[PDB]
mmCIF file of C-alpha atoms and ligand atoms in Angstrom:
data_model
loop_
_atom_site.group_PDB
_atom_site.id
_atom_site.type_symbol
_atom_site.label_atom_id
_atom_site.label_comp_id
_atom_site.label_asym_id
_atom_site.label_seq_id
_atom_site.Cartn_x
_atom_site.Cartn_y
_atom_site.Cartn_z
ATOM 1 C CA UNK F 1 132.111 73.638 54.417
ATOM 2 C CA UNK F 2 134.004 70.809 53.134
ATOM 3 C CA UNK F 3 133.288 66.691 53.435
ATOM 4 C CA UNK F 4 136.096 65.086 55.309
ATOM 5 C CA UNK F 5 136.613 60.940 56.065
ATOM 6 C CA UNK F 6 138.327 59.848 59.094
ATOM 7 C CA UNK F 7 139.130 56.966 60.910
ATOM 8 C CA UNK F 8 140.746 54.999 64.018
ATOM 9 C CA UNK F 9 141.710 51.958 65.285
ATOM 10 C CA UNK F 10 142.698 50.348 68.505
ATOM 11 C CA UNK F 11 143.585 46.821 70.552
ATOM 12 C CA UNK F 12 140.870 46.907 72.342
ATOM 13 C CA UNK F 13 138.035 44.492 74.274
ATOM 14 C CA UNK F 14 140.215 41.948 72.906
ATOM 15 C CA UNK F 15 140.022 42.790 69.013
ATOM 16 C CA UNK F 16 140.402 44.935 66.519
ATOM 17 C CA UNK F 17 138.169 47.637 66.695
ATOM 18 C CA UNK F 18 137.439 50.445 63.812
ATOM 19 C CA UNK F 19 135.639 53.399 63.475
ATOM 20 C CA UNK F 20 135.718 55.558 59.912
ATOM 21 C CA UNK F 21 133.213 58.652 59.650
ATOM 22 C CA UNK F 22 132.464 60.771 57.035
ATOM 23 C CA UNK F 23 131.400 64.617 58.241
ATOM 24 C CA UNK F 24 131.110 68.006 57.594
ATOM 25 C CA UNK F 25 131.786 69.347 61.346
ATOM 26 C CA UNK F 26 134.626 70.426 62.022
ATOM 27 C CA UNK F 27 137.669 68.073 62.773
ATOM 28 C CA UNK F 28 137.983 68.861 66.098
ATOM 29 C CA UNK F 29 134.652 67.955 66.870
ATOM 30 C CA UNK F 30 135.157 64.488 65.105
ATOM 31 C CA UNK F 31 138.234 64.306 66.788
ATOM 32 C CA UNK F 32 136.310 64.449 70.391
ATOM 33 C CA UNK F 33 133.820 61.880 69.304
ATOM 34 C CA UNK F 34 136.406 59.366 68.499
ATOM 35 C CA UNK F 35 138.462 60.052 71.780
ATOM 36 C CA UNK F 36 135.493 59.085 73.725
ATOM 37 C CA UNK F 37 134.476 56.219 71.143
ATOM 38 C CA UNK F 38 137.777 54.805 72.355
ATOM 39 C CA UNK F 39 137.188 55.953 75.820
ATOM 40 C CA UNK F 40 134.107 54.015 76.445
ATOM 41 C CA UNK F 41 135.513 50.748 74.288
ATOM 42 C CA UNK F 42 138.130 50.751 77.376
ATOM 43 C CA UNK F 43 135.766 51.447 79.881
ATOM 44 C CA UNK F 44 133.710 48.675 79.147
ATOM 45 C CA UNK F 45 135.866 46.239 78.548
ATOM 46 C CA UNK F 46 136.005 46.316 82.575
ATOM 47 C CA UNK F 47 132.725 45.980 82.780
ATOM 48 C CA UNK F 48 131.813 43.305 80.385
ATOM 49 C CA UNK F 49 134.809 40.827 79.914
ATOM 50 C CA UNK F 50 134.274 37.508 80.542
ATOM 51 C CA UNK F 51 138.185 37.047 80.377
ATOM 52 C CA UNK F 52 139.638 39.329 82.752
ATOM 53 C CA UNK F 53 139.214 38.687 86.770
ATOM 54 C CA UNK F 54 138.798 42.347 87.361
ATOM 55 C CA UNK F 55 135.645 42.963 85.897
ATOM 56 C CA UNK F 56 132.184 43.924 86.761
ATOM 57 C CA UNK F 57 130.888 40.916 85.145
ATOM 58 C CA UNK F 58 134.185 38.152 86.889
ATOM 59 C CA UNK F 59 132.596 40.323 90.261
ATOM 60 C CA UNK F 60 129.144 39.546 89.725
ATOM 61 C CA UNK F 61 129.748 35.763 88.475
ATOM 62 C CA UNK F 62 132.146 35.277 92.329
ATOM 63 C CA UNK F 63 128.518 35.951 93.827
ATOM 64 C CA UNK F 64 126.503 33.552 92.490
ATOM 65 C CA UNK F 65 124.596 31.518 94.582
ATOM 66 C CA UNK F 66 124.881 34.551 96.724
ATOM 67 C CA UNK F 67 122.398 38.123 97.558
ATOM 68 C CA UNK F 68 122.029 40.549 94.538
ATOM 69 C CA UNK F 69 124.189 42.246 93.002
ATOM 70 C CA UNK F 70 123.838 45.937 91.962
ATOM 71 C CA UNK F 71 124.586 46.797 88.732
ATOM 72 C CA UNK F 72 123.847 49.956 86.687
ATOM 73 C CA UNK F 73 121.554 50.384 84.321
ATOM 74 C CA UNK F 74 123.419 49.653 81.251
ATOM 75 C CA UNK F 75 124.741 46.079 82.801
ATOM 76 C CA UNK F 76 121.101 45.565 83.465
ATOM 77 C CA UNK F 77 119.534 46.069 80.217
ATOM 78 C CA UNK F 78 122.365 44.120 78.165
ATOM 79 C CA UNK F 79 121.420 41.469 80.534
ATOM 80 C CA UNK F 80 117.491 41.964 80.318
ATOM 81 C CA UNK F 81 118.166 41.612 75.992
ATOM 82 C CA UNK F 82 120.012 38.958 76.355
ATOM 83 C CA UNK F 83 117.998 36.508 78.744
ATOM 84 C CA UNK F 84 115.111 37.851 75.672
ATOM 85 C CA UNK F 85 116.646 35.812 73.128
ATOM 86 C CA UNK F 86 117.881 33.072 75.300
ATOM 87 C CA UNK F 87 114.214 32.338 75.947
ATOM 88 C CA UNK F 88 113.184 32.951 72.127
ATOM 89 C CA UNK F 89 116.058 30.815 71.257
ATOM 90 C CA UNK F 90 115.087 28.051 73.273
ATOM 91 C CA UNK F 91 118.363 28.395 74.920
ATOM 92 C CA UNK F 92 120.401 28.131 71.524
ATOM 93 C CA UNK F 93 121.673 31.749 72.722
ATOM 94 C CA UNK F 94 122.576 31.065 76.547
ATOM 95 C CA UNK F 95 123.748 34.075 78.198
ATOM 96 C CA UNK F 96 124.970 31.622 81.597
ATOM 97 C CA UNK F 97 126.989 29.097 79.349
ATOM 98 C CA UNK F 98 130.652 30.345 81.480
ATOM 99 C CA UNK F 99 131.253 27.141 83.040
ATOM 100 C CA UNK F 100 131.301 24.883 79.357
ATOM 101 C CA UNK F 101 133.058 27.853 78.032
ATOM 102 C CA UNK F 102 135.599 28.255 80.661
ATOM 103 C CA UNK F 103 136.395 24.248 79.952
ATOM 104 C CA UNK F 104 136.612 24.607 76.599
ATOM 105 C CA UNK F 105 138.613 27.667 76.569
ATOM 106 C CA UNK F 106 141.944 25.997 78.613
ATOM 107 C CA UNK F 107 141.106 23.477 75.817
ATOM 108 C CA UNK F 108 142.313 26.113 73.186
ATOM 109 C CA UNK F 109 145.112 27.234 74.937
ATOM 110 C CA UNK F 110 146.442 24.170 75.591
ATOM 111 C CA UNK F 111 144.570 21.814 72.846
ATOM 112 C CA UNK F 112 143.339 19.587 74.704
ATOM 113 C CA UNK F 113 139.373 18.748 74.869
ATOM 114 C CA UNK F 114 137.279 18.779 78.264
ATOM 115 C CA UNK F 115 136.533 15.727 80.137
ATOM 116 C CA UNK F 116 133.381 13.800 79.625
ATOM 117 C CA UNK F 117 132.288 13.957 83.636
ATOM 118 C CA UNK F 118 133.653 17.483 83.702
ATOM 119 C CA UNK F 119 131.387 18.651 81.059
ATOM 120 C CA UNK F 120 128.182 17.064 82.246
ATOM 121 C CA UNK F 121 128.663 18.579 85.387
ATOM 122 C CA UNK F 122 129.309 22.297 83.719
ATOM 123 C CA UNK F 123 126.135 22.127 81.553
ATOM 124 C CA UNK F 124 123.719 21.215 85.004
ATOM 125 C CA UNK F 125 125.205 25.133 85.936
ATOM 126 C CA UNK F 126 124.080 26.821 82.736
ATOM 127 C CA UNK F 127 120.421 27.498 83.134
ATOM 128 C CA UNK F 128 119.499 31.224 82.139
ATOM 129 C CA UNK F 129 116.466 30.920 84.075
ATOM 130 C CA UNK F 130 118.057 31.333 87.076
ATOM 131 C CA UNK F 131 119.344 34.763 86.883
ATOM 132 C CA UNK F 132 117.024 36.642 88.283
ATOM 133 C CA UNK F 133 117.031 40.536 87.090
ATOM 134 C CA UNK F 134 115.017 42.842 89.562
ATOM 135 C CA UNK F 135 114.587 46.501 89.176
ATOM 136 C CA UNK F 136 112.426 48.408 91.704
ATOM 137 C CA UNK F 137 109.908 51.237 90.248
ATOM 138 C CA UNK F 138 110.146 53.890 92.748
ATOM 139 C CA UNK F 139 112.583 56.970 91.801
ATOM 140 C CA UNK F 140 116.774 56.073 91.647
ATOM 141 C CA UNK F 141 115.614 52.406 92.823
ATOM 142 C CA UNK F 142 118.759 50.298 92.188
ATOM 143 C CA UNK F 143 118.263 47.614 89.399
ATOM 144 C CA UNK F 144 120.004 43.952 90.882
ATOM 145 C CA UNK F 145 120.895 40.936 89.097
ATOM 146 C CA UNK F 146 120.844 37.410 90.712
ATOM 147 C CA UNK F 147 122.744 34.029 90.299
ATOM 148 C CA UNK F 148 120.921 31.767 91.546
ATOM 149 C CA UNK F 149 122.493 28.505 90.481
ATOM 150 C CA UNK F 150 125.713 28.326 92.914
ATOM 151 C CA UNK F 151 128.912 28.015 89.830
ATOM 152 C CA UNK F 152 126.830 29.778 87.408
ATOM 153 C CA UNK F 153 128.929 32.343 85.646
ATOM 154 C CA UNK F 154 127.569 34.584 82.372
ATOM 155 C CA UNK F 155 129.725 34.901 79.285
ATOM 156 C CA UNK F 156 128.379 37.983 77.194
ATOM 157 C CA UNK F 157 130.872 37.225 74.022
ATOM 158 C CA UNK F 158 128.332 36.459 72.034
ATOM 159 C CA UNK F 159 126.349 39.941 72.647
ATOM 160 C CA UNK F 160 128.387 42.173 73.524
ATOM 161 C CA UNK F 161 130.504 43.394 70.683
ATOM 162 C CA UNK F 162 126.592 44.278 69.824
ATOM 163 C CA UNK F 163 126.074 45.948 72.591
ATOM 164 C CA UNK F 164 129.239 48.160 72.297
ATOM 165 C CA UNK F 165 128.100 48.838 68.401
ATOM 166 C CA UNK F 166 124.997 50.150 69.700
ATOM 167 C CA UNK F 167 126.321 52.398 72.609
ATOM 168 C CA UNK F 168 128.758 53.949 70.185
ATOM 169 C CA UNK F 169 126.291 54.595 67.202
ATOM 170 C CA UNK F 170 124.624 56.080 70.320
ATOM 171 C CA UNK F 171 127.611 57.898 71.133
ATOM 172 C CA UNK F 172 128.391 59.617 67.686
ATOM 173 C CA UNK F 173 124.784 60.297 67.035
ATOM 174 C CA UNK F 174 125.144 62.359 70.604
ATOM 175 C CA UNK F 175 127.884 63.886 68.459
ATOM 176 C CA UNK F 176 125.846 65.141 65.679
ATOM 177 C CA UNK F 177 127.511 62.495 63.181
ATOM 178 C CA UNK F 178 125.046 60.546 61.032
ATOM 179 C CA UNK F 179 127.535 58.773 58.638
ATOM 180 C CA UNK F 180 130.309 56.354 60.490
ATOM 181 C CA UNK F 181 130.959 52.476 59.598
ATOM 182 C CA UNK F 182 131.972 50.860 63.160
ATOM 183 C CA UNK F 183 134.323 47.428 62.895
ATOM 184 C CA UNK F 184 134.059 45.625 66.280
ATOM 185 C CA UNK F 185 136.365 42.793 65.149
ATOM 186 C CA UNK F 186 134.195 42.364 62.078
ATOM 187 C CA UNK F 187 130.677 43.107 63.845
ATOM 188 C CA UNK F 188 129.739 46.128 61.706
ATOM 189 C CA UNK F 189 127.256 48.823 61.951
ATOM 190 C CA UNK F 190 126.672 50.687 58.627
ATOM 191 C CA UNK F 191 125.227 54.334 60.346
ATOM 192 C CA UNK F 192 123.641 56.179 57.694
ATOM 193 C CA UNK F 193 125.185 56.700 53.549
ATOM 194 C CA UNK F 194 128.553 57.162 52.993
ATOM 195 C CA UNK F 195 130.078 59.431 50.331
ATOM 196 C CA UNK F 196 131.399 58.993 47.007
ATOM 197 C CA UNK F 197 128.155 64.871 46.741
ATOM 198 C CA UNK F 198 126.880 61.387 45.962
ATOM 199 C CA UNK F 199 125.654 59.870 49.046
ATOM 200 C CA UNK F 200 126.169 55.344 48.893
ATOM 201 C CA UNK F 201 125.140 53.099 50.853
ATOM 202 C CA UNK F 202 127.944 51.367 52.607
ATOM 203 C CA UNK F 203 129.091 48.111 50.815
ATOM 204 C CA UNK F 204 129.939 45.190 53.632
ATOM 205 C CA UNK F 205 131.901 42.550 53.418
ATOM 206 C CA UNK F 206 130.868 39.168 54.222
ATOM 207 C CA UNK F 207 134.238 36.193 54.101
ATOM 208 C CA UNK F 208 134.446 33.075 52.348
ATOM 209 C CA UNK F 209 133.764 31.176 56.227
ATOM 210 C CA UNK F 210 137.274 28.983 55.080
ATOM 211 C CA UNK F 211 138.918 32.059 53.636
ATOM 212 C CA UNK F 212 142.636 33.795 55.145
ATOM 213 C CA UNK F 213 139.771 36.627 55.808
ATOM 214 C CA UNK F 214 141.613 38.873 53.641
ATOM 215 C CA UNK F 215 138.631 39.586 51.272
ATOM 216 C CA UNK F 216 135.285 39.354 50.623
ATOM 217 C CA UNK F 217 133.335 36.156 49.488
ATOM 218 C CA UNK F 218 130.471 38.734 49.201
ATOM 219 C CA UNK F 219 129.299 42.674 49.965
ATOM 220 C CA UNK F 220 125.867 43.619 50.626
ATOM 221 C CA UNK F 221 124.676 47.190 50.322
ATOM 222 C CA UNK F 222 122.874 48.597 53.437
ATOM 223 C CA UNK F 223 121.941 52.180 55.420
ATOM 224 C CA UNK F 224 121.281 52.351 59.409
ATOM 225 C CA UNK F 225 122.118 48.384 60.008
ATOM 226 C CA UNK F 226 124.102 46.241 61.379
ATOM 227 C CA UNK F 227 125.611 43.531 60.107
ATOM 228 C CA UNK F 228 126.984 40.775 62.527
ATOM 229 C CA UNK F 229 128.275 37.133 61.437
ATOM 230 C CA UNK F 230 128.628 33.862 63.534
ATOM 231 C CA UNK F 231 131.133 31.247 61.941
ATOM 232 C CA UNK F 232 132.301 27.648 62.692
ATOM 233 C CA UNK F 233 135.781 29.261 61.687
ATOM 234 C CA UNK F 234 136.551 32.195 63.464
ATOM 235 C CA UNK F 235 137.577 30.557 66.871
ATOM 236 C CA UNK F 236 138.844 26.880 67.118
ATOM 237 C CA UNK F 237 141.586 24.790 67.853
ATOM 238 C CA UNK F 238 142.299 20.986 65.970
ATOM 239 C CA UNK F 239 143.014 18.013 68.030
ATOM 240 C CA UNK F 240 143.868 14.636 66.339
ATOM 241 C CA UNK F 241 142.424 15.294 63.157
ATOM 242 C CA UNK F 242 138.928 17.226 64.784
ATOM 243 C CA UNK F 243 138.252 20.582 65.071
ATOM 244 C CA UNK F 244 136.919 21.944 67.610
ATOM 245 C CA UNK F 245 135.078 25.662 67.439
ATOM 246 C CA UNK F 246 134.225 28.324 69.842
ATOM 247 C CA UNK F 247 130.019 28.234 69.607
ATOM 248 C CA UNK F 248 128.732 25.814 71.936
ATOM 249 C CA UNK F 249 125.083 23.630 71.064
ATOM 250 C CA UNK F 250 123.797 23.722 74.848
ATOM 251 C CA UNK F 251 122.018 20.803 74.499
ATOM 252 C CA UNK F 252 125.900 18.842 73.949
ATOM 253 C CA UNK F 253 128.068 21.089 75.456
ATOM 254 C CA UNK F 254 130.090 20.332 72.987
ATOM 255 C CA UNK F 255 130.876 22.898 69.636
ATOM 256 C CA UNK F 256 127.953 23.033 67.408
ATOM 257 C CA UNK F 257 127.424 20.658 64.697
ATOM 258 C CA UNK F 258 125.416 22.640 62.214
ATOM 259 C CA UNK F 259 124.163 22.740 58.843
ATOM 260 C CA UNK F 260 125.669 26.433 57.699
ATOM 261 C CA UNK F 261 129.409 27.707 57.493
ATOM 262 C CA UNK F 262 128.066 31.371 58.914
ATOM 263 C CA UNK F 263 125.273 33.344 59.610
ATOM 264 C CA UNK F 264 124.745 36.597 59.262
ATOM 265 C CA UNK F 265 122.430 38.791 60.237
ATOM 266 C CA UNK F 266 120.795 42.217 59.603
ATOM 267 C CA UNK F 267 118.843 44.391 62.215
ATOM 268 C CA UNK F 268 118.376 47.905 63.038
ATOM 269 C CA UNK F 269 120.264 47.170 66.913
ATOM 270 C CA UNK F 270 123.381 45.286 66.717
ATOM 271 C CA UNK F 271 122.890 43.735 69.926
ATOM 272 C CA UNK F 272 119.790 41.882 68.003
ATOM 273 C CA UNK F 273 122.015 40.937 65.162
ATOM 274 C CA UNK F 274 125.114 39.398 67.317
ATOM 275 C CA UNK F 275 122.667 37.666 69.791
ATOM 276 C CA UNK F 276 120.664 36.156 66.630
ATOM 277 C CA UNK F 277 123.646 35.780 64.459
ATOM 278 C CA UNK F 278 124.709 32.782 67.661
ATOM 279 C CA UNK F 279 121.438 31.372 68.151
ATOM 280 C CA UNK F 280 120.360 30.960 64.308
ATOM 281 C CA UNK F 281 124.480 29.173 63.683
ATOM 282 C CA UNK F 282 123.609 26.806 66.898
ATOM 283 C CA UNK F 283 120.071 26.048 65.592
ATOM 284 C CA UNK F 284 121.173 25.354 61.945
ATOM 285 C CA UNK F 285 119.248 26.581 59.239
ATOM 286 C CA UNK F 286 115.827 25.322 58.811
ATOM 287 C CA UNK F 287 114.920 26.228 62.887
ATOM 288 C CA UNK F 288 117.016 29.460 62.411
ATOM 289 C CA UNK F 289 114.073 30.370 59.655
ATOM 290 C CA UNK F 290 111.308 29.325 61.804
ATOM 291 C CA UNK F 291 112.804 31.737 64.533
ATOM 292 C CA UNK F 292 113.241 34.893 62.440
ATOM 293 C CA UNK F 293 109.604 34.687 61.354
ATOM 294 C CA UNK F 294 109.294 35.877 64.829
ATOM 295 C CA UNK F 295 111.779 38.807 64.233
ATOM 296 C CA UNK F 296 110.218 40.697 61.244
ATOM 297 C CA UNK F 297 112.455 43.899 61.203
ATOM 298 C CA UNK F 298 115.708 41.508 60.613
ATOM 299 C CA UNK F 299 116.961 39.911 57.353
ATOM 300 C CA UNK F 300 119.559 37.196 57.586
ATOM 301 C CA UNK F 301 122.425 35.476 55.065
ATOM 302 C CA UNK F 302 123.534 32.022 55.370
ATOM 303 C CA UNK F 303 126.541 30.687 53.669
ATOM 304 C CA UNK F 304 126.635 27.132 53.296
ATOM 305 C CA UNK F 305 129.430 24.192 53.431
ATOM 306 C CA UNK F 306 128.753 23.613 49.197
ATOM 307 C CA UNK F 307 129.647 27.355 48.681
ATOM 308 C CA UNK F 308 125.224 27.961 48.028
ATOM 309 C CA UNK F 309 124.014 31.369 49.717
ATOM 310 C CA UNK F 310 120.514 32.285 50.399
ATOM 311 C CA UNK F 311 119.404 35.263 51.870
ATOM 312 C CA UNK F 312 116.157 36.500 53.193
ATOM 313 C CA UNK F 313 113.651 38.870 50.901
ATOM 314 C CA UNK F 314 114.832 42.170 52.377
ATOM 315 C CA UNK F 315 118.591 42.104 51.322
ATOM 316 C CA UNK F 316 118.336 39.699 49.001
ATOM 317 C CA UNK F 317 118.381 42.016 46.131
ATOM 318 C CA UNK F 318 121.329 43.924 47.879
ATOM 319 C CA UNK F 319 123.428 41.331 47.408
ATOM 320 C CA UNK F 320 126.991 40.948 45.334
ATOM 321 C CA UNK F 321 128.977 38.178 44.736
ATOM 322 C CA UNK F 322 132.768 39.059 44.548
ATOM 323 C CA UNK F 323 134.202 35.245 44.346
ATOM 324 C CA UNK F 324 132.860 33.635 42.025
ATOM 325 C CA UNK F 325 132.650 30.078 43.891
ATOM 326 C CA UNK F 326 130.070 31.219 45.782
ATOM 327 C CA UNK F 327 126.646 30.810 44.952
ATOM 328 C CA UNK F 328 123.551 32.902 45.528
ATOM 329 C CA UNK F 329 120.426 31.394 45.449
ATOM 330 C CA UNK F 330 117.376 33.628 44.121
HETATM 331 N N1 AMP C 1 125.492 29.009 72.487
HETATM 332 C C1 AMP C 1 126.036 30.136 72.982
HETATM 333 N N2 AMP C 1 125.271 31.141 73.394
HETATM 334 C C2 AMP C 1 125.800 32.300 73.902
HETATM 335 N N3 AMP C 1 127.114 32.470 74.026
HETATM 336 C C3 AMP C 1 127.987 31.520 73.600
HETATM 337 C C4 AMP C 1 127.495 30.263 73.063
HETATM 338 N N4 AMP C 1 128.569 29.506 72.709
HETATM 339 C C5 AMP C 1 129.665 30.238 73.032
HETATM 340 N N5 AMP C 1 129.310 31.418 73.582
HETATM 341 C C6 AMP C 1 130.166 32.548 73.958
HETATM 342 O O1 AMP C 1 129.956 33.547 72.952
HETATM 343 C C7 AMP C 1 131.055 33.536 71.994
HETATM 344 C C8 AMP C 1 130.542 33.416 70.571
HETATM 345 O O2 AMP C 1 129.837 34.563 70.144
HETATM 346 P P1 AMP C 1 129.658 34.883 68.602
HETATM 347 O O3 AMP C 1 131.057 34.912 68.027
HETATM 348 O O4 AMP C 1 128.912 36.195 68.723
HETATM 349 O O5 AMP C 1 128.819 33.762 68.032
HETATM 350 C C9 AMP C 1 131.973 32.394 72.441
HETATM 351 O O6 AMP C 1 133.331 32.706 72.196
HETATM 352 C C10 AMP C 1 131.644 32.209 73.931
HETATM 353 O O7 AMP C 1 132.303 33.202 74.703
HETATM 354 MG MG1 MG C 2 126.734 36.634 68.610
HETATM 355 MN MN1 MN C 3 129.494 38.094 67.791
#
């Protein structure tokens, strides 16, 4: 029985998306997990888009300041996880941030920047706290979500490319795989050791956060984690001379001014790592330390603006520089 590497790739929930797996089952079998890896990527983009008026989510955000909404139980506890690290965030993760982003957004397209008025009004109907989830405890009860804040709309991009990583580690784990590298538009999850039979670890990339993205500042070696980066660079659009990027600081409503080029972090659930990856690049990094002291299980890799890298005690050592320019800090 004979070690075989496969992969595929689709336009899909608005990105690139990648899965390569190394097995031993046979290819058939493979072949079926990746047909419904692709099958679910399409699904839920109908669910989760923020983008797209025909969604579950564009449904649910036309009802608020209306009666729950039921949702099933997948909707409900991507919802649940995020509204978790909105509040340990202080709101530097904000799950309800659809009306700045929505201003902003028309901004990119056509590059022009919101209006002051316009934006103050968009930030007073952004506050988490007022979606209410409720889920009742007797048997098939239906689990609701609630908008309370009339205009209030949820934008999941910054948790739900972790979300899908999880579901389809899930997914080829049902499958009996235990060795796959998933590329969500560059949110990664390294399930279990490659091959060379010598078993690796998987090597990921991390870019220079000004680079053409082509290669790697920087790999770190990791097993069964994901690896999810928030950058200043990835999303903007330049008007008169300013640029103006994609991750909004709440408190402004304007795109974060921060002290790091990216973030990037490590955790056993990708849905922790792209949730985290946002709030740590809003908070800059001194209060981005202070909140993964909370987080034990999760290591995290900052790249500066001076080309300096520092990188928490558990990958640290795992750590390779591949352009020289770069600097890491021991
Ligand atoms: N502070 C924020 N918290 C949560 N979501 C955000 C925030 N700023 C922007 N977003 C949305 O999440 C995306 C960024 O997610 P990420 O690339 O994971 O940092 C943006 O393109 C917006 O759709
Ligand atoms: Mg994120
Ligand atoms: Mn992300």
């Amino acid at each position: 029985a004979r070690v075989r590497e496969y992969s595929r790739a689709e336009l899909v929930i608005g990105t690139l998306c990648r899965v390569r797996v190394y097995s031993k089952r046979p290819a058939a079998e493979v072949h079926a997990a990746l047909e419904e890896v692709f099958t679910l990527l399409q699904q839920q983009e109908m669910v989760l888009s923020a983008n797209r008026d025909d969604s579950a989510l564009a449904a649910l955000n036309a009802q608020a300041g209306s009666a729950p909404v039921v949702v099933d139980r997948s909707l409900y506890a991507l919802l649940e996880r995020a509204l978790f690290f909105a509040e340990k965030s202080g709101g530097a993760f904000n799950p309800a941030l659809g009306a700045v982003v929505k201003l902003w957004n028309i901004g990119f397209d056509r590059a022009a920047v919101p209006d002051p008025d316009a934006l103050k009004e968009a930030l007073t109907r952004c506050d988490f706290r007022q979606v209410h989830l409720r889920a009742g405890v007797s048997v098939g009860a239906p689990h609701t979500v609630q908008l309370a804040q009339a205009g209030m709309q949820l934008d999941l991009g910054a948790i739900a490319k972790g979300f899908l990583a999880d579901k389809i580690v899930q997914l080829l784990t049902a499958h009996a795989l235990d060795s796959a590298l998933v590329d969500l538009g560059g949110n990664i999850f390294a399930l279990g050791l490659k091959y060379g039979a010598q078993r690796l670890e998987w090597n990921v990339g991390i870019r220079d956060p000004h680079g053409t993205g082509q290669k790697p500042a920087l790999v770190v070696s990791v097993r069964d984690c994901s690896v999810v980066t928030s950058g200043a660079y990835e999303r903007f659009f330049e008007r008169d001379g300013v640029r103006y990027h994609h991750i909004i600081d709440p408190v402004t409503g304007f795109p974060a001014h921060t002290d790091v080029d990216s973030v990037s972090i490590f955790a056993p659930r990708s849905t922790d790592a792209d949730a985290l990856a946002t709030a740590c690049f809003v908070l800059g990094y001194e209060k981005s330390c202070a909140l993964l002291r909370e987080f034990p299980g999760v290591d995290a890799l900052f790249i500066f603006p001076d080309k300096r890298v520092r990188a928490s005690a558990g990958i640290v050592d795992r750590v390779r520089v591949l352009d020289a320019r770069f600097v890491l800090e021991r």
